[PDB]
Write a protein that binds this ligand. Sequence first.
Ligand code: HEM
Ligand code: HEM
Ligand code: HNI
Ligand code: HNI
Lengths: 146, 146, 141, 141
Amino acid sequence: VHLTPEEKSAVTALWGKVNVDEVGGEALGRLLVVYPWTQRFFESFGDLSTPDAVMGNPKVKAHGKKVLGAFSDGLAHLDNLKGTFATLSELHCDKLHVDPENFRLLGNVLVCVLAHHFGKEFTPPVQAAYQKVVAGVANALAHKYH
Amino acid sequence: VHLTPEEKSAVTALWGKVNVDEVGGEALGRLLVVYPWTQRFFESFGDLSTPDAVMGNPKVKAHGKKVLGAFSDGLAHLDNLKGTFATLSELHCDKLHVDPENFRLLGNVLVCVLAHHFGKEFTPPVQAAYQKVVAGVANALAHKYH
Amino acid sequence: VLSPADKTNVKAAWGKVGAHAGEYGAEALERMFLSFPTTKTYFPHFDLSHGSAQVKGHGKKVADALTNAVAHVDDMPNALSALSDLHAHKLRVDPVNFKLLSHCLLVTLAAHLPAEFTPAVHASLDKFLASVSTVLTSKYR
Amino acid sequence: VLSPADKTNVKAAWGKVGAHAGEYGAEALERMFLSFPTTKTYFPHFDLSHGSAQVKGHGKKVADALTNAVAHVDDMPNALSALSDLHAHKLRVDPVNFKLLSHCLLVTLAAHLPAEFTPAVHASLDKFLASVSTVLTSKYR
Ligand code: HEM
Ligand code: HEM
Ligand code: HNI
Ligand code: HNI
């Protein structure tokens, strides 16, 4: 999982430029558009029938903020992701019944959203560092499943 | 992964009844038959044209025995699979250029071979314990890749 | 693509299973829930207790669908059309799980077909279950 | 299956890529080798470091193959037939790796197409690359 100090600094530097609320809504929305079976968890969110219906859905946006908010907090604990996300892992398993494959899909979409936003600034080495991060976070969220 | 005392007991108990020679040869042979692209590493093993040629190949059987022998030794290090397989991980990465997906394929084939041999004795809980082991060994062998 | 040789191997193997299919389906589900606990996230509404009648009933349905797919191995997309609709539009099971059930079905067949589960038949059954999985996920997006 | 809208989206996006296809192919490979080191096991004879002439050349070949797939989007199994043979019988790249290159291609396109890479286009491109991947692994067994 773990990153070099060069990679940790690259992750932190880029994230300082990230609007977490906005990127969160964008990432969750794109997840539901690109992999539409992931909509199964969000029947109570209302209209998800078109890409625009999904991306601009107020509840999708609100939940995206919440999810990436927790992600962002976790970036302060890259040495202990499993501990950091233990209670959320338990919750997603026991209460929400969310297949952990969804965490991996979200990670992939998030990397795409960062690339889209930052363009050439999202260099291959920076991508590699963030790939380590999203893999680590997905693995951490999957860890307490039983 | 992380085995419970009960699962560790079940794994060791079944393994004491395993003919490593037979099971090793069967597992590698079936890997090459069921997922024939895995033959790419074994051009020097000679005739691999038909299932019968693969299963009866002396180098396949030799090399299956060697692999499962190292697997067997690893079972004495269940709480530190990454440490014990660190040397072989580097070897398979840097010297042999073996895609770690191959470790996962072999694990699944091994479980099939054990089920084929033991029949009803390979109960769902025993399978579940062995799935944890083969996953752990595959992850350990992939851990030092770079 | 399933070869003519594959189809022969699958039909013969499933023929040997015969009326045990329903039982083997339930066993494969039990093996899947135990070995791959994340798959239980699709059945929180099920009773998953030991010997669950609900799991047994579901195993029968899965088995019957596979039996029908074997009988129509030349035209599986059409045979499994309604089932493909159901998984894509309602159940929405992530595609990665189909490999997990397929493996557990293979393991179940191996444990019950000592003479029949040759390397060649092993290969054909694996291809068949992958083909079924492909059809069942063909309408997901 | 690619929808009419998918095909419109893929053609429009690849059209915007235009003369940069080869460059983006090389960049996607570089991204893959750095983000997913296991993929390097298939190129032990390659210089894989940044600025590699071998990677640049290979990038062009991959891009050209994708351009041809776009041109024959309704007949990709036949258009990519020789390439599918090459991967199945010679190179024997494990099928799991095609998703890795596909993701890195998407990331590359996202980084270069700010206006074009909408969520709908994103979805279509992902489906397209998955379809190309399916064709390239269709003859493995
Ligand atoms: C070869 C693969 C599979 C086959 C042949 C199959 C077949 C079936 C069948 C026949 C039904 C019942 C349809 C009906 O009652 O109208 C069903 C329902 C269902 N399947 Fe699948 N299935 C497969 C894979 C999977 C996998 C991998 C999962 C999840 C891990 C899954 C989850 C479900 C669920 C949750 C239901 C609804 C059960 C209920 O509420 O009663 N299926 N499937
Ligand atoms: C969309 C996916 C892919 C496309 C379109 C593609 C296309 C190509 C093309 C056009 C060639 C050159 C064929 C020739 O020289 O006759 C090639 C070769 C090759 N590909 Fe693929 N490929 C894909 C995926 C992959 C992946 C994922 C890997 C490994 C991780 C891979 C490994 C190789 C290797 C090792 C070669 C030989 C390179 C050499 O020796 O110069 N390919 N591919
Ligand atoms: C595709 C499904 C899915 C994914 C990929 C996902 C990925 C993530 C990730 C990955 C980075 C994080 C950090 C995260 C964090 C959270 N999720 Ni997730 N969640 C998902 C489905 C949910 C659902 C469903 C809820 C409950 C929402 C509701 O209706 O209240 C949820 C609720 C939460 C909550 C609020 C907890 C509570 O209500 O007590 C947090 C925090 N999450 N989710
Ligand atoms: C792709 C297939 C492949 C798989 C799945 C695989 C899986 C494993 C597993 C998984 C349980 C283990 C424990 C293992 C252990 C070993 N392998 Ni693997 N190996 C594989 C391809 C090789 C090859 C190739 C060699 C070299 C053989 C030779 O001819 O020299 C090898 C050599 C070895 C050796 C001998 C090392 C030495 O020379 O000192 C050991 C031990 N291994 N291999």
